[PDB]
Write a protein that binds this ligand. Structure first.
Ligand code: HEM
Ligand code: HEM
Lengths: 394, 394
């Protein structure tokens, strides 16, 4: 189909033709669901429009939620302590300033050796076995460890924390009461501990800055909400980047050759893989005013889907070859991590995971096979990530 | 309709004819959903069968959930720390023994004066106004205060705790992430405090008995799960009892007269109101073996709905007048609180709330009007409770 529809597990394999039809024939596309026309919304598919809209938080607000479902906030129960990703400036600004103290080059650097050691252990296990499911074995557990690091979870607690993570990621994707309860409970204790034993992580930084101090329960709640944002934001996305890169690399031995011969080209290659996988394929905003983009006026009060995945594939920005892998492309202004106020805090951490995984795949498992038709994609309309990528090595 | 269907807001007004058709023509009724026949289940509608099945936890297990939906436990996320209501003996037995220490006559007696003071304040406010919505004003907030008492929540925290309660009750009925997180967070702190400042409540008793002691995180989790059981079990049910009693009393001035002339008959009247309102109208079990009841064999591995609401209206147990209010009936072996291992821990607390509310309604607002067709019932197929009961007083 070339007709717009929110993605499902069955339609994630190849949304690209549908994106191209939108970019070419209806860049400001009005969706009116036949069964509930009251839930109409708009879709932005071009790079220029998505880039500008992401930046313009004034006009395009995050404060009513990030899906095209108008009942979202009440449906999930996120009105009273909205996560930072559903806050507009100025509310968003102070908390983002404080938490950013846990997202410096230091925090990416300190976990890199742990990432590499884990990637190596799992890839060697897969190699010895002639392959296996690289998602369950590596691409799923890896990002959970990195989120744990950023939350200052002691290494000894990583296995327990991963249990909760996986339940929440599954429930969030498209149902995790024990996990959401156990986690919010665990973090209550960790926050308390960080009052007297602060480290360099984001939770320690929030506590040290006085968030939740002197009976400010709302502050403590904001820290807890941040842990949920981290778990829901830093896991399935990374798995989508890592798993989604596999067929792209497999089908382009010329591109693998470039990186085998020049491993120093791997950071640039990571940008290209991020552009093409765009794990967050789209997120919504709500218009605060009527806004005209080209020949269409979007009314105030409607949801607008920013199709990062299409923006990243826009021939107007990247050329007629936008749909193809070119590891030397050095794409700029990618929308994989959005743009503006909410630009992904974990961008450096995601880039580091991609770099280490790609480096070790080429070094340890260079003769590998992926069957694209055997990939199983997760349900859910916003994030594109595989549940399984069968993987064979010789 | 007289054809079996799970109840909705629209069908809660009058399920009784449908129950009677089941009792008379298909007491062991096989439901095969046309759209998903793989989700077939059975319904028990007679008192004798429901009484025996509730008692026989061996044959009729709670461990797979309490609804007729086979995916229930994973859908809600309650596998890893199953609540006590979804535990079978022997697992269920120790925890129930420990927590029962917080459900003695002492705990009902200590909160009664607070209940009465609140009922009085709200009824006087309604009287002064010539009526209003007795659900929002009284029948909703009251049971939340009583659950707070049983959880050892300090009175100063009751307003905050009610906020979370209402979100969870709405989400549980048929979506409360901030509430479920804030509550599980709050209780983590309260449990910690009870380690050194124990009171006579159920949480204090669990902590004093060593549940969660010495790094036993699973124990602490069980206490947290119990708070959720309490919030989901002790609120909408009581509101259903109180609100559901209103039309029954209104339409029977002879029955009100009996209690105006003999207020000492009110405890017995409460049993009759519990029988007719049966707020938990049904809950499911799973068969562990093939079981024959009359001419029908229920296979092992299927859900069986125990229709407490029909059992309570069974002419075979209560007589041809089973459908009618008789405050002097003194019904015995009611199934309002089930029967056997899981018999409602809050039965005494529910009975006390009914008694106080009924006593004060007759004393303060005896000339009152309820329009049954104006009552709005909550969605959800298991608990029958109004969201609104318009109420007028002269
Ligand atoms: C390839 C992997 C990732 C992708 C594609 C991705 C994508 C995004 C996007 C698109 C946003 C902005 C959302 C919007 O437009 O409304 C965002 C925000 C965010 N991301 Fe990521 N993310 C990734 C990995 C991570 C990781 C690993 C972490 C944590 C270590 C993380 C933490 C966050 C946080 C905390 C925000 C909220 C920032 C704010 O609202 O100010 N992300 N991410
Ligand atoms: C009219 C009001 C109430 C009704 C109709 C009701 C009904 C029930 C029923 C039918 C069960 C057994 C569930 C099953 O068959 O699987 C139960 C269990 C339970 N109820 Fe209630 N309940 C009411 C009020 C309360 C209150 C006020 C509290 C707390 C103060 C409470 C706490 C509990 C608990 C903790 C259990 C679990 C017992 C166990 O599984 O061992 N209930 N209730």
């Amino acid at each position: 189909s070339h007709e717009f529809q929110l993605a499902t597990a069955e339609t994630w394999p190849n949304p690209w033709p549908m994106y191209r039809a939108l970019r070419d024939h209806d860049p400001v596309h009005h969706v009116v669901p036949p069964q509930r026309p009251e839930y109409d919304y708009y879709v932005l598919s071009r790079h220029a429009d998505v880039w500008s809209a992401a930046r313009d938080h004034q006009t395009f607000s995050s404060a009513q939620g990030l899906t095209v479902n108008y009942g979202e906030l009440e449906m999930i129960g996120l009105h009273d302590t909205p996560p930072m990703v559903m806050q507009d400036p100025p509310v968003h600004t102070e908390f983002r300033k404080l938490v950013s103290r846990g997202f410096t080059p230091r925090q990416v650097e300190t976990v890199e050796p742990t990432v590499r050691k884990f990637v190596v252990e799992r890839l060697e296990k897969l190699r010895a076995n002639g392959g296996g499911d690289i998602v369950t074995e590596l691409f799923k557990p890896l990002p959970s460890m990195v989120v744990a690091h950023y939350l200052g979870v002691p290494e000894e607690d990583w296995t327990q924390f991963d249990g909760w993570t996986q339940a929440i990621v599954a429930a969030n994707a498209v149902g995790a009461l024990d996990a959401v309860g156990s986690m919010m409970a665990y973090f209550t204790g960790l926050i308390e501990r960080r009052r007297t034993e602060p480290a360099d992580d984001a939770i320690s930084h929030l506590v040290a800055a006085g968030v939740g101090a002197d009976g400010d329960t709302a502050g403590t709640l904001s820290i807890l909400a941040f842990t949920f944002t981290m778990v829901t934001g830093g896991n399935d996305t990374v798995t989508g980047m890592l798993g989604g890169s596999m067929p792209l690399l497999h089908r382009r031995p010329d591109q693998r050759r470039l990186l085998l011969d020049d491993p120093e080209g791997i950071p640039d290659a990571v940008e290209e893989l991020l552009r093409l996988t765009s794990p967050v394929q789209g997120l919504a905003r709500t218009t605060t005013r009527d806004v005209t983009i080209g020949d269409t006026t979007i009314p105030a009060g409607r949801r607008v889907l920013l199709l990062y995945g299409s923006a990243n594939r826009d021939e107007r920005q990247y050329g007629p070859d936008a749909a193809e892998l070119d590891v030397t492309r050095c794409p700029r202004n990618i929308l994989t991590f959005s743009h503006g106020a909410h630009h992904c805090l974990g961008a450096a951490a995601a880039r580091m995971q991609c770099r280490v995984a790609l480096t070790e795949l080429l070094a340890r498992c260079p003769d590998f096979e992926v069957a694209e038709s055997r990939i199983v994609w997760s349900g859910g309309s916003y994030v594109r990530r595989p549940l399984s990528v069968p993987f064979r090595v010789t």
